[PDB]
Short mmCIF file of C-alpha atoms and ligand atoms in Angstrom, two decimals:
data_model
loop_
_atom_site.label_atom_id
_atom_site.label_comp_id
_atom_site.label_asym_id
_atom_site.label_seq_id
_atom_site.Cartn_x
_atom_site.Cartn_y
_atom_site.Cartn_z
CA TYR A 1 0.00 0.00 0.00
CA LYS A 2 1.09 3.60 -0.54
CA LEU A 3 0.99 6.28 2.14
CA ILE A 4 1.32 9.65 0.39
CA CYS A 5 1.99 12.54 2.75
CA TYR A 6 2.02 16.29 2.15
CA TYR A 7 4.32 18.79 3.87
CA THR A 8 3.57 22.50 3.52
CA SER A 9 6.18 25.24 2.99
CA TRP A 10 4.41 27.84 5.05
CA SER A 11 4.23 25.68 8.18
CA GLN A 12 7.79 26.78 9.00
CA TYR A 13 6.49 30.24 9.97
CA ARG A 14 4.04 29.19 12.71
CA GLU A 15 5.02 30.35 16.18
CA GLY A 16 6.59 28.21 18.84
CA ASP A 17 5.80 24.52 18.75
CA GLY A 18 3.62 24.96 15.67
CA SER A 19 6.76 25.61 13.62
CA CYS A 20 7.48 22.57 11.47
CA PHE A 21 10.54 21.91 9.27
CA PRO A 22 11.16 18.82 7.05
CA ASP A 23 13.54 17.26 9.57
CA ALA A 24 10.63 16.79 11.99
CA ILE A 25 9.35 14.15 9.55
CA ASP A 26 9.86 10.47 10.43
CA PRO A 27 11.63 8.96 7.35
CA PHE A 28 9.86 5.62 7.82
CA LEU A 29 6.31 6.89 8.31
CA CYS A 30 5.20 7.49 4.70
CA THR A 31 6.14 5.87 1.41
CA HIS A 32 5.98 9.19 -0.47
CA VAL A 33 6.33 12.76 0.81
CA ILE A 34 5.13 15.66 -1.30
CA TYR A 35 6.45 19.20 -0.85
CA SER A 36 3.80 21.93 -1.45
CA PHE A 37 3.93 24.10 -3.45
CA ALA A 38 6.17 25.07 -6.36
CA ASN A 39 5.29 28.12 -8.43
CA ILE A 40 5.32 28.81 -12.18
CA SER A 41 7.32 31.81 -13.41
CA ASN A 42 7.92 32.74 -17.05
CA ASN A 43 6.16 29.47 -17.83
CA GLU A 44 8.70 27.46 -15.90
CA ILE A 45 8.47 25.60 -12.60
CA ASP A 46 10.12 27.63 -9.86
CA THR A 47 10.59 27.93 -6.11
CA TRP A 48 8.03 29.70 -3.93
CA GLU A 49 9.53 30.50 -0.52
CA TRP A 50 12.82 32.36 -0.14
CA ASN A 51 14.41 29.33 1.54
CA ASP A 52 12.89 26.51 -0.56
CA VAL A 53 16.18 25.22 -2.02
CA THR A 54 17.39 24.72 1.55
CA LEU A 55 14.17 23.02 2.65
CA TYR A 56 14.24 20.88 -0.53
CA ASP A 57 17.67 19.72 0.56
CA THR A 58 16.51 19.04 4.13
CA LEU A 59 13.52 16.99 2.92
CA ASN A 60 15.57 14.95 0.51
CA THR A 61 18.29 14.01 3.02
CA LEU A 62 15.58 11.93 4.73
CA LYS A 63 16.29 9.53 1.90
CA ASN A 64 19.74 8.87 3.36
CA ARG A 65 17.94 7.26 6.28
CA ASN A 66 15.19 5.49 4.31
CA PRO A 67 16.47 4.77 0.75
CA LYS A 68 12.98 3.49 -0.17
CA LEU A 69 11.43 6.93 0.45
CA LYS A 70 10.22 8.84 -2.62
CA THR A 71 9.67 12.61 -2.68
CA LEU A 72 7.65 14.71 -5.11
CA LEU A 73 7.20 18.42 -5.64
CA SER A 74 3.64 19.69 -6.00
CA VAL A 75 2.83 22.61 -8.34
CA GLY A 76 -0.27 24.73 -7.96
CA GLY A 77 -2.30 24.63 -4.79
CA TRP A 78 -5.05 26.81 -3.34
CA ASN A 79 -3.21 30.16 -3.53
CA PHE A 80 -2.34 29.57 -7.15
CA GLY A 81 -4.94 31.03 -9.47
CA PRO A 82 -6.45 28.19 -11.51
CA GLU A 83 -6.69 30.73 -14.35
CA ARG A 84 -2.90 30.80 -14.36
CA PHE A 85 -2.90 27.04 -14.99
CA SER A 86 -5.51 27.61 -17.71
CA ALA A 87 -3.36 30.09 -19.61
CA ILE A 88 -0.35 27.79 -19.50
CA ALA A 89 -2.20 24.61 -20.49
CA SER A 90 -4.36 26.04 -23.33
CA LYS A 91 -1.43 27.16 -25.49
CA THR A 92 0.79 24.44 -26.89
CA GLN A 93 3.87 26.69 -26.73
CA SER A 94 3.59 27.83 -23.11
CA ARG A 95 2.64 24.25 -22.21
CA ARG A 96 5.72 22.74 -23.93
CA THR A 97 7.93 25.31 -22.24
CA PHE A 98 6.62 24.45 -18.77
CA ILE A 99 6.95 20.70 -19.39
CA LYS A 100 10.51 21.02 -20.66
CA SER A 101 11.56 22.91 -17.53
CA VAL A 102 10.34 20.29 -15.06
CA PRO A 103 12.80 17.33 -15.27
CA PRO A 104 16.03 19.38 -14.88
CA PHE A 105 14.50 21.21 -11.89
CA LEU A 106 13.45 17.95 -10.22
CA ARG A 107 16.86 16.40 -10.98
CA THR A 108 18.80 19.39 -9.58
CA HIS A 109 16.90 19.36 -6.29
CA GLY A 110 16.63 15.62 -5.82
CA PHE A 111 12.90 15.02 -6.32
CA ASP A 112 11.53 11.75 -7.70
CA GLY A 113 8.46 13.23 -9.34
CA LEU A 114 5.92 15.97 -9.89
CA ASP A 115 2.47 16.32 -8.35
CA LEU A 116 -0.16 18.41 -10.17
CA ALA A 117 -2.47 20.43 -7.93
CA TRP A 118 -4.60 22.42 -10.38
CA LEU A 119 -7.51 23.45 -8.14
CA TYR A 120 -9.69 23.29 -10.17
CA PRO A 121 -10.02 22.74 -13.94
CA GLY A 122 -13.18 24.16 -15.51
CA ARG A 123 -15.38 22.91 -18.36
CA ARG A 124 -13.18 24.73 -20.90
CA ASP A 125 -10.04 23.20 -19.37
CA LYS A 126 -10.84 19.48 -19.46
CA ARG A 127 -9.25 18.98 -22.89
CA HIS A 128 -6.06 20.88 -22.03
CA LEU A 129 -5.59 19.09 -18.68
CA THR A 130 -5.54 15.82 -20.62
CA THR A 131 -2.95 17.28 -23.00
CA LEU A 132 -0.80 18.52 -20.11
CA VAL A 133 -0.80 15.12 -18.40
CA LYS A 134 -0.14 13.18 -21.62
CA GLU A 135 2.72 15.39 -22.75
CA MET A 136 4.22 15.69 -19.27
CA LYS A 137 4.35 11.88 -19.00
CA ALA A 138 5.75 11.49 -22.53
CA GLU A 139 8.55 13.88 -21.52
CA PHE A 140 9.28 11.87 -18.36
CA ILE A 141 9.43 8.66 -20.38
CA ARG A 142 11.91 10.33 -22.74
CA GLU A 143 14.09 11.77 -19.96
CA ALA A 144 14.60 8.31 -18.44
CA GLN A 145 16.44 7.17 -21.57
CA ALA A 146 19.42 8.94 -20.00
CA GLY A 147 19.71 6.05 -17.56
CA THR A 148 18.06 7.55 -14.48
CA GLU A 149 14.94 6.20 -12.76
CA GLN A 150 11.84 7.57 -14.50
CA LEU A 151 10.14 10.48 -12.75
CA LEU A 152 6.74 9.94 -11.14
CA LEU A 153 3.66 11.92 -12.17
CA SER A 154 0.68 12.34 -9.87
CA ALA A 155 -2.33 14.61 -9.54
CA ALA A 156 -4.55 15.79 -6.68
CA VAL A 157 -8.15 15.56 -7.93
CA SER A 158 -11.49 16.93 -6.71
CA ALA A 159 -13.83 14.48 -5.00
CA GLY A 160 -16.95 16.49 -5.83
CA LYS A 161 -19.16 14.84 -8.47
CA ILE A 162 -19.93 18.09 -10.26
CA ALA A 163 -16.31 19.25 -10.23
CA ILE A 164 -15.24 15.89 -11.68
CA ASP A 165 -17.87 15.86 -14.45
CA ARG A 166 -16.97 19.43 -15.33
CA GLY A 167 -13.17 19.41 -15.51
CA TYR A 168 -11.64 15.94 -15.82
CA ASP A 169 -11.47 13.16 -18.38
CA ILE A 170 -10.82 10.53 -15.71
CA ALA A 171 -10.49 7.56 -18.07
CA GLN A 172 -7.78 9.35 -20.08
CA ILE A 173 -5.56 10.90 -17.41
CA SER A 174 -5.71 7.70 -15.32
CA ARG A 175 -3.65 5.94 -18.01
CA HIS A 176 -0.80 8.44 -17.69
CA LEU A 177 -0.68 9.21 -13.96
CA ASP A 178 1.20 6.98 -11.53
CA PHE A 179 -1.40 7.68 -8.85
CA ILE A 180 -4.36 9.98 -8.26
CA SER A 181 -5.08 11.52 -4.87
CA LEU A 182 -8.79 12.03 -4.18
CA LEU A 183 -9.42 15.15 -2.10
CA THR A 184 -12.06 13.41 -0.02
CA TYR A 185 -12.20 16.08 2.68
CA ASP A 186 -13.67 19.19 1.09
CA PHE A 187 -17.35 18.25 1.24
CA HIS A 188 -18.55 21.05 3.50
CA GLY A 189 -17.56 24.28 5.21
CA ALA A 190 -17.19 25.85 1.79
CA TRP A 191 -19.32 28.91 2.44
CA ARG A 192 -22.47 27.13 3.67
CA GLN A 193 -24.92 28.60 6.21
CA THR A 194 -25.32 25.35 8.11
CA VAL A 195 -23.23 22.99 10.25
CA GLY A 196 -21.91 19.79 8.65
CA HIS A 197 -18.91 17.48 8.36
CA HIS A 198 -16.34 18.06 5.60
CA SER A 199 -15.01 14.49 5.47
CA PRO A 200 -17.78 11.94 6.07
CA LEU A 201 -17.07 8.37 4.94
CA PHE A 202 -20.72 7.46 4.26
CA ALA A 203 -23.83 9.45 3.36
CA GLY A 204 -25.89 8.76 6.47
CA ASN A 205 -29.61 8.26 5.79
CA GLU A 206 -30.50 11.19 8.05
CA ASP A 207 -31.04 14.14 5.65
CA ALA A 208 -30.40 12.63 2.21
CA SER A 209 -29.69 15.64 -0.03
CA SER A 210 -25.93 15.88 -0.44
CA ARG A 211 -25.96 12.32 -1.55
CA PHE A 212 -22.73 12.85 -3.47
CA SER A 213 -20.72 14.48 -0.68
CA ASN A 214 -19.02 11.59 1.09
CA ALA A 215 -15.86 9.54 0.47
CA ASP A 216 -17.77 6.38 -0.47
CA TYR A 217 -19.64 8.05 -3.32
CA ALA A 218 -16.49 9.76 -4.66
CA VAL A 219 -14.53 6.49 -4.70
CA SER A 220 -17.36 4.48 -6.34
CA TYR A 221 -17.80 7.19 -8.95
CA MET A 222 -14.10 7.37 -9.86
CA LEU A 223 -14.01 3.59 -10.23
CA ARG A 224 -17.06 3.78 -12.50
CA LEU A 225 -15.56 6.54 -14.63
CA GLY A 226 -12.62 4.28 -15.43
CA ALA A 227 -9.85 4.94 -12.92
CA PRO A 228 -8.20 1.72 -11.70
CA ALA A 229 -8.31 1.07 -7.97
CA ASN A 230 -4.57 0.42 -8.06
CA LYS A 231 -3.93 4.05 -9.03
CA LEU A 232 -6.46 5.57 -6.65
CA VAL A 233 -5.41 7.01 -3.31
CA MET A 234 -7.95 8.26 -0.76
CA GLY A 235 -7.35 11.59 0.96
CA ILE A 236 -7.47 11.71 4.76
CA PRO A 237 -7.40 15.08 6.53
CA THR A 238 -5.25 15.81 9.52
CA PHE A 239 -7.08 19.06 10.20
CA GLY A 240 -10.61 20.00 11.21
CA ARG A 241 -13.03 22.66 10.05
CA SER A 242 -14.66 25.03 12.56
CA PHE A 243 -17.84 27.10 12.73
CA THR A 244 -19.22 29.85 14.92
CA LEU A 245 -22.75 28.79 15.89
CA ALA A 246 -25.60 31.26 15.34
CA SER A 247 -27.83 29.58 17.93
CA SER A 248 -27.54 27.29 20.93
CA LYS A 249 -28.51 24.39 18.64
CA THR A 250 -25.60 21.94 18.22
CA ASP A 251 -27.07 19.02 16.25
CA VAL A 252 -27.45 18.35 12.51
CA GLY A 253 -28.55 21.30 10.37
CA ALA A 254 -28.01 23.95 13.10
CA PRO A 255 -27.45 27.61 12.08
CA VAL A 256 -23.99 28.99 11.50
CA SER A 257 -22.86 32.63 11.60
CA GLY A 258 -19.50 32.08 9.96
CA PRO A 259 -16.20 30.18 10.27
CA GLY A 260 -14.71 29.29 13.62
CA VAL A 261 -12.31 31.39 15.63
CA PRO A 262 -8.64 31.01 14.50
CA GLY A 263 -6.35 28.49 16.13
CA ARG A 264 -3.52 29.91 18.24
CA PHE A 265 -0.86 28.34 16.00
CA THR A 266 -2.46 27.98 12.57
CA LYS A 267 -4.15 31.39 12.61
CA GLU A 268 -6.66 30.68 9.89
CA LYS A 269 -10.38 31.21 10.42
CA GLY A 270 -12.29 28.01 9.78
CA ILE A 271 -9.37 25.62 10.20
CA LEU A 272 -7.70 23.91 13.15
CA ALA A 273 -4.72 21.56 13.18
CA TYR A 274 -5.23 18.21 14.87
CA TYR A 275 -2.82 19.23 17.63
CA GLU A 276 -4.97 22.34 18.19
CA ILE A 277 -8.11 20.18 18.29
CA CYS A 278 -6.50 17.98 20.95
CA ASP A 279 -6.23 21.08 23.12
CA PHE A 280 -9.73 22.26 22.17
CA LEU A 281 -11.26 18.97 23.33
CA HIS A 282 -10.55 19.75 26.99
CA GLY A 283 -13.88 21.03 28.26
CA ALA A 284 -15.69 20.24 25.03
CA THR A 285 -18.59 17.91 24.32
CA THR A 286 -17.73 15.26 21.76
CA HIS A 287 -20.21 13.61 19.43
CA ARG A 288 -20.03 11.20 16.50
CA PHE A 289 -22.25 10.85 13.45
CA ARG A 290 -23.00 7.13 13.49
CA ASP A 291 -24.10 7.00 9.85
CA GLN A 292 -21.16 9.06 8.52
CA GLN A 293 -18.70 7.56 11.02
CA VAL A 294 -16.85 10.79 11.84
CA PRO A 295 -16.75 12.90 15.04
CA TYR A 296 -17.41 16.53 15.90
CA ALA A 297 -17.17 18.60 19.07
CA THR A 298 -18.50 21.78 20.67
CA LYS A 299 -17.46 24.26 23.33
CA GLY A 300 -19.29 27.55 23.83
CA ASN A 301 -20.31 28.77 20.38
CA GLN A 302 -17.59 26.85 18.51
CA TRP A 303 -18.43 23.76 16.45
CA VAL A 304 -15.62 21.57 15.08
CA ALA A 305 -15.77 18.72 12.53
CA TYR A 306 -12.61 16.58 12.67
CA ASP A 307 -11.05 13.14 12.32
CA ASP A 308 -9.57 11.16 15.18
CA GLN A 309 -7.57 7.90 15.34
CA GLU A 310 -10.78 5.90 15.19
CA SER A 311 -12.35 7.57 12.14
CA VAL A 312 -9.01 7.63 10.33
CA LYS A 313 -8.48 3.88 10.96
CA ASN A 314 -11.99 3.33 9.74
CA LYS A 315 -11.31 5.15 6.47
CA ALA A 316 -8.09 3.14 6.05
CA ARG A 317 -9.99 -0.18 6.36
CA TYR A 318 -12.56 1.06 3.88
CA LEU A 319 -9.89 1.78 1.28
CA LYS A 320 -8.27 -1.62 1.84
CA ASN A 321 -11.66 -3.29 1.39
CA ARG A 322 -12.07 -1.57 -1.97
CA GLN A 323 -8.49 -2.49 -2.86
CA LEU A 324 -7.29 1.05 -3.52
CA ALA A 325 -3.58 1.85 -3.91
CA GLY A 326 -3.41 3.48 -0.50
CA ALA A 327 -3.95 6.68 1.44
CA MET A 328 -2.95 10.32 1.10
CA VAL A 329 -2.62 12.56 4.13
CA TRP A 330 -3.04 16.32 4.23
CA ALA A 331 -0.92 17.27 6.00
CA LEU A 332 2.02 16.13 8.17
CA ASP A 333 2.49 19.56 9.74
CA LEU A 334 -1.13 19.55 10.88
CA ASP A 335 -0.88 16.19 12.67
CA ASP A 336 0.62 16.21 16.22
CA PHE A 337 4.14 16.00 14.75
CA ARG A 338 5.95 16.80 18.02
CA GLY A 339 3.65 14.36 19.81
CA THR A 340 3.23 16.63 22.83
CA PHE A 341 -0.32 17.96 22.41
CA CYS A 342 -2.49 14.87 22.08
CA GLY A 343 -1.60 13.00 25.24
CA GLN A 344 -0.32 9.53 24.38
CA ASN A 345 3.39 10.30 23.85
CA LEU A 346 3.08 9.33 20.15
CA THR A 347 4.59 11.31 17.26
CA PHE A 348 2.13 11.77 14.29
CA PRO A 349 -0.80 9.94 15.94
CA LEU A 350 -3.20 10.32 13.00
CA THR A 351 -0.78 9.39 10.22
CA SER A 352 0.60 6.50 12.32
CA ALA A 353 -2.92 5.17 12.92
CA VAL A 354 -3.39 5.01 9.14
CA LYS A 355 -0.02 3.32 8.63
CA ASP A 356 -0.82 0.62 11.19
CA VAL A 357 -4.03 -0.38 9.45
CA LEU A 358 -2.29 -0.38 6.08
CA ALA A 359 0.45 -2.63 7.46
CA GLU A 360 -2.06 -5.31 8.59
CA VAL A 361 -3.34 -7.90 6.11
C1 LIG B 1 -5.93 23.10 5.73
C2 LIG B 1 -4.78 23.88 5.10
O1 LIG B 1 -3.61 23.50 5.24
N1 LIG B 1 -5.13 24.96 4.40
C3 LIG B 1 -4.26 25.42 3.34
C4 LIG B 1 -4.22 26.93 3.30
O2 LIG B 1 -3.92 27.46 4.58
C5 LIG B 1 -3.13 27.29 2.31
O3 LIG B 1 -2.93 28.71 2.30
C6 LIG B 1 -1.91 29.14 3.14
O4 LIG B 1 -2.49 29.98 4.16
C7 LIG B 1 -1.53 30.62 5.06
C8 LIG B 1 -2.33 31.68 5.80
O5 LIG B 1 -3.55 31.16 6.30
C9 LIG B 1 -0.32 31.27 4.32
O6 LIG B 1 0.75 31.59 5.27
C10 LIG B 1 1.68 32.59 4.91
O7 LIG B 1 2.66 32.03 4.01
C11 LIG B 1 3.58 33.02 3.48
C12 LIG B 1 4.55 32.30 2.58
O8 LIG B 1 3.94 31.92 1.36
C13 LIG B 1 4.40 33.67 4.59
O9 LIG B 1 5.23 34.74 4.03
C14 LIG B 1 6.50 34.80 4.61
O10 LIG B 1 6.35 35.37 5.91
C15 LIG B 1 7.51 35.17 6.74
C16 LIG B 1 7.22 35.88 8.04
O11 LIG B 1 6.69 34.96 8.98
C17 LIG B 1 8.79 35.67 6.05
O12 LIG B 1 9.92 35.23 6.79
C18 LIG B 1 8.88 35.15 4.61
O13 LIG B 1 10.07 35.61 3.98
C19 LIG B 1 7.62 35.58 3.86
N2 LIG B 1 7.75 35.35 2.42
C20 LIG B 1 8.21 36.34 1.64
C21 LIG B 1 9.62 36.88 1.89
O14 LIG B 1 7.54 36.84 0.73
C22 LIG B 1 3.53 34.15 5.78
O15 LIG B 1 4.37 34.30 6.91
C23 LIG B 1 2.39 33.16 6.16
N3 LIG B 1 1.46 33.85 7.05
C24 LIG B 1 0.33 33.28 7.48
C25 LIG B 1 -0.96 33.94 7.01
O16 LIG B 1 0.29 32.30 8.24
C26 LIG B 1 0.22 30.39 3.19
O17 LIG B 1 1.13 31.13 2.39
C27 LIG B 1 -0.93 29.94 2.32
N4 LIG B 1 -0.46 29.17 1.19
C28 LIG B 1 -0.33 29.76 0.01
C29 LIG B 1 0.28 28.95 -1.12
O18 LIG B 1 -0.67 30.93 -0.18
C30 LIG B 1 -3.49 26.78 0.91
C31 LIG B 1 -2.28 26.96 0.00
O19 LIG B 1 -2.65 27.29 -1.33
O20 LIG B 1 -3.78 25.36 0.94
C32 LIG B 1 -4.71 24.94 1.97
O21 LIG B 1 -5.97 25.43 1.67
C1 LIG B 2 5.28 33.02 -8.82
O1 LIG B 2 5.52 33.32 -10.18
C2 LIG B 2 4.70 34.40 -10.64
C3 LIG B 2 5.14 34.69 -12.07
O2 LIG B 2 4.62 33.73 -12.97
C4 LIG B 2 4.87 35.66 -9.77
O3 LIG B 2 3.76 36.56 -10.07
C5 LIG B 2 4.10 37.90 -10.12
O4 LIG B 2 5.43 38.02 -10.54
C6 LIG B 2 6.01 39.19 -9.97
C7 LIG B 2 6.31 38.88 -8.51
O5 LIG B 2 5.52 39.68 -7.63
C8 LIG B 2 5.07 40.38 -10.16
O6 LIG B 2 5.93 41.51 -10.41
C9 LIG B 2 5.48 42.79 -10.68
O7 LIG B 2 5.56 42.94 -12.14
C10 LIG B 2 6.11 44.20 -12.61
C11 LIG B 2 6.18 44.15 -14.12
O8 LIG B 2 5.98 42.82 -14.58
C12 LIG B 2 7.38 44.51 -11.86
O9 LIG B 2 8.24 45.46 -12.54
C13 LIG B 2 9.30 44.98 -13.36
O10 LIG B 2 10.41 44.56 -12.54
C14 LIG B 2 11.63 44.29 -13.31
C15 LIG B 2 12.34 45.61 -13.53
O11 LIG B 2 12.43 46.37 -12.34
C16 LIG B 2 11.33 43.64 -14.66
O12 LIG B 2 12.38 42.75 -15.01
C17 LIG B 2 10.01 42.88 -14.62
O13 LIG B 2 9.79 42.27 -15.88
C18 LIG B 2 8.86 43.85 -14.31
O14 LIG B 2 8.42 44.42 -15.54
C19 LIG B 2 6.76 45.04 -10.59
O15 LIG B 2 7.63 45.85 -9.80
C20 LIG B 2 6.40 43.75 -9.87
O16 LIG B 2 7.61 43.07 -9.57
C21 LIG B 2 4.04 40.10 -11.31
O17 LIG B 2 3.18 41.22 -11.49
C22 LIG B 2 3.20 38.83 -10.99
N1 LIG B 2 2.72 38.19 -12.21
C23 LIG B 2 1.48 37.69 -12.28
C24 LIG B 2 1.36 36.18 -12.39
O18 LIG B 2 0.46 38.39 -12.25
C25 LIG B 2 5.02 35.37 -8.23
O19 LIG B 2 5.63 36.49 -7.60
C26 LIG B 2 5.90 34.12 -8.01
N2 LIG B 2 6.17 33.70 -6.64
C27 LIG B 2 5.48 34.07 -5.56
C28 LIG B 2 4.00 34.42 -5.67
O20 LIG B 2 6.00 34.08 -4.45
#
């Protein structure tokens, strides 16, 4: 099984214990670590943070400890305008230029592959995404003639039915990608006036309307569209999404005034790292959606939807039962990486819980 794990560039800037650098990563935890995110300048892949080349080097020395470890560099991401990807992909010349610049960059910095995080392709982009993937892979196949191990090509893909139908030719790109990471954790929160869980495993008969917004539907759909299970990787979040309640009602459907109050370390309204949730739980009431099989918690007027060791292990068994290639975790720096916030003196409790299940039959 594969355990794909993301590490984010900007996590180095968090204060105190929240600060996370690549060397905090256990070399034997994941099978693949992906550095997010690279930028595109003058139609060429490029660094993003001022100290990326140094962090690239720090991440890749982990391979001196675990020679089996593979690293990839992800381009795009949420703060990368998808229109920018559009412009590059729609013109054969700017597209060829970008593709040509990738291998030498990856080779210079020690990466084993490229991860595409175009979030998200539109109806007019579907055709060009296919072209980009095809041609990128053809270039990787050609570069390997030089005697070096062929570069890996992956892509992070939306798990929303409508987003998939609109921007991706799943049957086509599946043939060229080494693996596809399903973003099965962005099913709610996204500017909605009600409380709900962003990463439910199952639909849950109670309130059948967002019948498509659960991991089980996304996986089944991808398999139906033509993607092989052995190339599919299910996304598991290491963060939670928060809401400020508009009323004293805490159960399903309850009013919401806006995103939750920022975490002390992550400082982003609406999000909380797992290590911040561990702290939040003290004095909170915990609940669990039995149908969806994921927990949530409340304290005062704050409502948090998250994943714990139990729900994460549950998702890992589900993916094994459907014979998928493995799991993807977003993100290592959001898990209790120091292992000092969540109690049991365990480093990376969430990611480790997933690894344990994956290591069983
Ligand atoms: C669940 C999850 O992980 N969500 C992410 C989402 O958060 C990502 O967006 C990221 O959000 C945070 C803010 O919420 C951004 O953090 C800033 O990152 C920049 C670097 O890109 C930092 O700039 C640097 O600042 C330090 C000072 O501390 C200087 O030393 C650096 O030199 C300076 N860079 C220079 C010189 O220009 C800044 O400190 C961070 N401040 C914050 C707000 O914490 C983060 O950048 C941002 N990511 C991006 C790419 O914009 C999102 C990513 O797209 O993905 C998920 O949705
Ligand atoms: C990620 O890559 C992006 C490029 O694809 C990049 O986007 C931006 O790139 C510049 C960085 O901020 C930004 O620069 C502004 O452009 C002006 C003119 O283009 C520039 O003035 C001139 O500067 C020198 C001469 O002094 C000249 O050589 C330049 O060509 C330029 O004409 C302004 O002072 C200013 O620098 C671009 O506007 C912007 N482009 C886009 C995509 O809109 C990101 O900065 C890169 N990395 C990140 C975000 O960290």
